Amino acid sequence: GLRSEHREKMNRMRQRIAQRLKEAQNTCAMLTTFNEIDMSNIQEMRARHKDAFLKKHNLKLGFMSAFVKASAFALQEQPVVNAVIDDATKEVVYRDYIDISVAVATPRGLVVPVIRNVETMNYADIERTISELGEKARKNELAIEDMDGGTFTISNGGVFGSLFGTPIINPPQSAILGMHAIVDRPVVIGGKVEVRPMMYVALTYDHRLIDGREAVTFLRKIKAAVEDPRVLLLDL
Amino acid sequence: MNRMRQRIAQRLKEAQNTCAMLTTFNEIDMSNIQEMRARHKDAFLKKHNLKLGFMSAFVKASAFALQEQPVVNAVIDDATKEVVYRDYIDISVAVATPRGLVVPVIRNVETMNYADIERTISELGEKARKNELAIEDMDGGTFTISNGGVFGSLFGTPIINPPQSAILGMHAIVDRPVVIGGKVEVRPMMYVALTYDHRLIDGREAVTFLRKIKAAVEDPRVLLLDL
Amino acid sequence: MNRMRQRIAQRLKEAQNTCAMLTTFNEIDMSNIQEMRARHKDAFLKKHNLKLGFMSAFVKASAFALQEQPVVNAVIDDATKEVVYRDYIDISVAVATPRGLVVPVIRNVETMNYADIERTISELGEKARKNELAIEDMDGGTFTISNGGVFGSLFGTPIINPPQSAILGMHAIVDRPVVIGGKVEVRPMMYVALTYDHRLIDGREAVTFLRKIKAAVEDPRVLLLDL
Amino acid sequence: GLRSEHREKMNRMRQRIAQRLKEAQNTCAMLTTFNEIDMSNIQEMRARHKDAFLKKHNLKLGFMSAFVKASAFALQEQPVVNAVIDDATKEVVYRDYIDISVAVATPRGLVVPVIRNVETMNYADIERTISELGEKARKNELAIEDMDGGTFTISNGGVFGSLFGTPIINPPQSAILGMHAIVDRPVVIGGKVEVRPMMYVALTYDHRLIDGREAVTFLRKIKAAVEDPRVLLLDL
């Protein structure tokens, strides 16, 4: 055999990132709750609205916008999940606005832009902002003010094939949604086993501020808004 | 509480207070390994005087995955602010004794076949059955494989053994319905969980490492192709 | 007849007048290798920028069989009345060029994967396509694999390359009816012929060596088990 | 990599064996002709006469005796194949007697006893002689006079799984029969494909003395005598 232990020194900013990551766990009391979403409806919608959508808006219709809009609706329903707890003053600051940070992928790494005031956006606007920030961040010119102060987060581990896992809360928030890969699985529809494209979804919430019942109902609200997008119009 | 059990508890809490631990799960189709061993077992037993379990397949697949991604094999040292890499690879595997469970180490697994891994596992399992297992046979593993399957668990989150950056936790094999070629079918499946130190290993890296282990265990011929 | 062709003919006759040559045949079911490559080809091409042929599988299987039985890897020297063994193993594989066929050598095949063997084969096939192939890349093979299959032959008797004790001759793959589990079935099969020097290698040894190659090629996972 | 060429010197008798082996090729003009034998009848016979045969003779009923007896019958039919050519005197010596050498397996190696005057033996006698010599040779006490002067040979490569090959004539003879492993193969019986246990058989003959037609007819005679053992009784 052989032995060798070459090494590299940790730079300043990576050390800062690690310290911040540990502070995130040492500040919040994190727990996770999982659920499954039937992705048939979104796939069926996009597989026929993609062509006309591409012609109209010069954009590709992914399913990220549906999740972003559903999460925005769920947050609007339950303000507490949109709030954050500040220990420096012993105050639970609420927020009337809602902006969401979505992770984008670059060969150099992954970064998290922010979508400002998502409550007034359609699917087209969300997709356009996502594409604009994904091409703007592909080149390194992404400034701090486009990454600062998200209230809620959506993490994408699905594109790499994970089944389900526990994400970690980005410091200045109270929750994070972690999506995962879509897999064909057998499910029971109307008392009969059937094959559908399903995906597990995991939510991590700060148990100090958000009760377990609140987190579970919030996740079920996201599920309801993603399975049948027409729920968004009914304000149901 | 005696001295050493108290020390164990303190070390266990230090493990969580040092690393930033997260977990990611996946499922592995165990048809191929079962089919291989159910017909190579007899000749393997005659040739090597050994029983062909599926532990060696997982150990070798994990070794291959680690060799593919060096960062997962590295550890982070806070005492000096350095990320020490390792060119060698040794793996600690948990063995069961009536008195308890202990974790020997397999040295330099990158140069071993299935037969060598099985022989080392059997030798250490019989050597540890008797209490004569020394410290130097338990010190300094770079990666770990934990066995909760033999007791019937479905899936769970293991805890990183202090001087490492990841741990693989296997679980019981259960027959479950899965979709093969658009049609529901019954196969023997098992959930696998990986716990990684999020300070050093990115989520994408952990997910790809777990998928690499899955690819190497589902179709062992991937090991030969270096794919 | 030019000088070198006359020398080649004289050497060829000396090959028969030195060794006591016999041949033994067998059949190999090529389903597994075809199924492996027909789905690992794309990812293998992306990873290594190479085409996954079945030559590497045969080379590796022959290397494993030779390692199992040292005597087949040995050669008999009449100039000193000594049977020289060899701890190393290098294999000569025939490559095709429009001007003719030549036989490079693969050095120390015992430490190679499929990827390394394929890379060496491609490198020597493109290096020999241009005439710049030197003597030291063709001298001193211990075992040989001859390719008559690409031209459509069914089976035949190859001739031992002088400084060796055996030669493996592959042949074309043809779909033939075979009995699997008591029922006639269609599979892609191929006849394989071995020529061995009967002075040094016993008939039983040659037959067992050929069966070992068959076992290693039908189910590549035998390579990992060291079975 | 590594290189090492340890070696062992060839002893006297192994060198003599090699010299004799090369002399065998340099004396005879060897050729080979193959054929296939349907082994259904012998298997069916022994699979039901084995028990009573074991009780009667305290012996195991293999198929070696059938081949030995069939070869003896074929040799008796064609005397020329039983003859040998002597270059030392330019004479083709015939033989009225017939003895056959059969190879036996020992952990130390393989050796070839001789069965004397096989023309007057049943299956039971041949099996008894084979067993007696196989147990006598298992212990090293096998003398020269039990190995000298066979007129015809039967070689066993089947037990090791070979399909077919070319054997080499034992010096003081004119032919050798090489059996091979029994494999289930599809064959055409009455115009319809069917599965039967078949085995390839190879004959090597000295082309100086034996014509190709004679060798082919001799092999077909062995096939006829082994497929339907009742041919032995009919003297057909």
Full DSSP string of chain B: --HHHHHHHHHHHHHHHHS-EEEEEEEEE-HHHHHHHHHHHHHHHHHHS----SHHHHHHHHHHHHHH-HHHH-EEETTTTEEE--SS--EEE-EEETTEEE--EE--GGG--HHHHHHHHHHHHHHHHSS---GGGTS--SEEEEE-GGGT---------TTSSEEEEE---EEEEEEETTEEEEEEEEEEEEEEETTTS-HHHHHHHHHHHHHHHH-TTHHHHT-
- Residue pair C89/C67 in contact (Cβ under 8 Å)? The answer is yes
Strand partners, D86: D91
**Distance linking the first and last C-alpha atoms of chain B:** 50
Give the helix/strand (H/E) hosting C7: helix C3-18
Q: Is C108 helix (H, G, I), strand (E, B) or coil?
A: coil
C-alpha distances in Å from residue A72, one per residue of A13, A76, A211, D68: 32, 6, 19, 91
Q: Quick check: C113 and B224 CB within 8 A?
A: yes
d(CA B225, CA C12): 37
DSSP E strands, A61-191: 84-86, 91-93, 100-102, 104-106, 109-111, 114-115, 152-156, 164-165, 175-179, 183-189
Identity (one letter) of the amino acid at B194?
L
d(CA D185, CA D195): 6
Strand partners, A131: none
Quick one: tokens of B191? 């959930």
Interface test with C, best of D3, D6, D7 (most C CBs within 10 A): D7
Q: Which residue has the tokens 């991604």?
A: B69
Give the helix/strand (H/E) hosting D123: helix D123-138
- Residue pair A185/A152 in contact (Cβ under 8 Å)? The answer is no
The catalytic residue among A125, A211, A228, A235 is A211
DSSP E strands, chain D: 7-9, 30-38, 84-86, 91-93, 100-102, 104-106, 109-111, 114-115, 152-156, 164-165, 175-179, 183-189, 192-206
- Residue pair C63/C56 in contact (Cβ under 8 Å)? The answer is no
d(CA B145, CA B158): 10
**DSSP character for C136?**
G
| Partner C, chain D 110-149, Cβ-Cβ below 8 Å | 110
**DSSP character for C59?**
H
The dihedral of CA A204, A206, A211, A214: what is its sign? negative
- Residue pair B195/B210 in contact (Cβ under 8 Å)? The answer is no
Distance from CA of A2 to the nearest CA of B (A): 6
Quick one: tokens of D37? 């034998």
Residues 6 or more apart whose Cβ sits within 8 Å of residue B144: B91, B92, B93, B94, B103, B160, B161, B164, B166, B167, B168
Helix axes A123-138, A40-57, angle to 10 degrees: 70
Nearest to C85 among D2, D6, D167 (CB): D6
C-alpha distances in Å from residue C208, one per residue of B208, C68, C194: 43, 10, 11
How big is chain B, counted in residues? 227
Nearest to B84 among A7, A165, A166 (CB): A7
C-alpha distances in Å from residue C138, one per residue of C2, C60, C91, C107, C133: 22, 19, 10, 10, 8
d(CA A170, CA A176): 7
Catalytic residue set of C: 198, 202
Q: Which of A161, A30, A203, A133 is nearest to B204 (CA)?
A: A161
- Residue pair B198/A168 in contact (Cβ under 8 Å)? The answer is yes
Residue B38: left if φ>0, alpha if ψ -120 to 50, beta else—which one?
alpha
Residues 6 or more apart whose Cβ sits within 8 Å of residue B208: A160, A161, B69
d(CA D33, CA D203): 6
Alpha carbon C49 to its chain's center:
24
C with A: touching (≥3 Cβ pairs within 8 Å): no
From chain D, the residues in CB contact with C199 under 8 A are 17-18, 21-22
**Distance linking the first and last C-alpha atoms of chain A:** 66
d(CA B26, CA B192): 5
d(CA D126, CA D66): 9
| Residues B69-86 as b or e (16 or more Cβ within 10 Å = b) | eeebbbbbeeeeeebeeb
Q: Is C18 helix (H, G, I), strand (E, B) or coil?
A: helix
Distance from CA of A236 to the nearest CA of B (A): 33
**CA torsion, points D74, D75, D77, D81, in degrees to nearest 10?**
120
B202 catalytic per annotation = yes
- Residue pair C224/B224 in contact (Cβ under 8 Å)? The answer is yes
Quick one: tokens of D119? 């023309």
Interface test with C, best of B44, B47, B208, B224 (most C CBs within 10 A): B224
Strand partners, C178: C185
DSSP H helical ranges for C110-181: 114-129
Q: Quick check: C81 and D157 CB within 8 A?
A: no
Identity (one letter) of the amino acid at A10?
M
B to C CB pairs, distance under 8 Å: 54
Quick one: tokens of D76? 């008796």
Residues 6 or more apart whose Cβ sits within 8 Å of residue A61: A46, A49, A50, A53, A54, A123, A127
| Residues B113-150 as b or e (16 or more Cβ within 10 Å = b) | bbbbbbbbbbebeeebeeeebeeeeeeebbbbbbbbbe
Q: Is B14 on the interface with A (CB under 8 A)?
A: no
Q: Which residue has the tokens 């064609």?
A: D78
C with D: touching (≥3 Cβ pairs within 8 Å): yes
Q: Is D194 helix (H, G, I), strand (E, B) or coil?
A: strand
User: Is beta strand B183-197 parallel, antiparallel or unpaired with respect to B21-29?
Assistant: antiparallel
Return contacts of B33-41, CB within 8 angstroms, 24+ apart.
B33/B57, B33/B217, B33/B220, B34/B188, B36/B220, B36/C221, B40/C221, B40/C222, B40/C225, B40/C227
Q: Is B212 on the interface with C (CB under 8 A)?
A: no
Identity (one letter) of the amino acid at A215?
A
d(CA D141, CA D133): 10
From chain B, the residues in CB contact with A168 under 8 A are 20, 22, 198
Method used experimentally? cryo-EM
The catalytic residue among B40, B137, B202, B226 is B202
Q: Is B36 on the interface with C (CB under 8 A)?
A: yes
DSSP H helical ranges for C19-110: 31-48, 55-68, 70-73
d(CA B67, CA B79): 26
Q: Which of A121, A3, A130, A137 is nearest to A70 (CA)?
A: A121
**∠ Cα D115 D116 D120 (to 5°):** 105
A86 catalytic per annotation = no
Residues 6 or more apart whose Cβ sits within 8 Å of residue D137: D104, D106, D111, D113
In 10 A of CB C166, how many CB atoms? 26
d(CA A162, CA A142): 28
Q: Which of C110, C104, C116, C18 is nearest to C70 (CA)?
A: C110
A with B: touching (≥3 Cβ pairs within 8 Å): yes
Quick one: tokens of D207? 């082309």
* Listed resolution, Å: 3.5
- Residue pair D163/C25 in contact (Cβ under 8 Å)? The answer is yes
The dihedral of CA D187, D191, D193, D195: what is its sign? negative
Q: Is C111 helix (H, G, I), strand (E, B) or coil?
A: helix
d(CA A154, CA A69): 11
d(CA B29, CA B17): 35
Identity (one letter) of the amino acid at A63?
F
Q: Which of A211, A184, A190 is nearest to A39 (CA)?
A: A184
Dihedrals φ, ψ of A65, to 5°? -60, -40
Q: Is D109 on the interface with C (CB under 8 A)?
A: yes
Q: Is C23 on the interface with D (CB under 8 A)?
A: yes
d(CA B28, CA B190): 6
User: Is beta strand D104-106 parallel, antiparallel or unpaired with respect to A84-86?
Assistant: unpaired
Quick one: tokens of B16? 């969580």
- Residue pair B202/B178 in contact (Cβ under 8 Å)? The answer is no
| Residues D193-223 as b or e (16 or more Cβ within 10 Å = b) | eeeebbbbbbbbbbeebbeeeebeebbebbb
Residue C9 burial (C-beta neighbours within 10 Å; 0-12, 13-18, 19+): exposed
Distance from CA of A193 to the nearest CA of B (A): 9
- Residue pair D215/D203 in contact (Cβ under 8 Å)? The answer is yes
Q: Which chains touch A (3 or more CB pairs under 8 A)?
A: B
d(CA A105, CA B204): 10
Give the helix/strand (H/E) hosting C187: strand C183-197
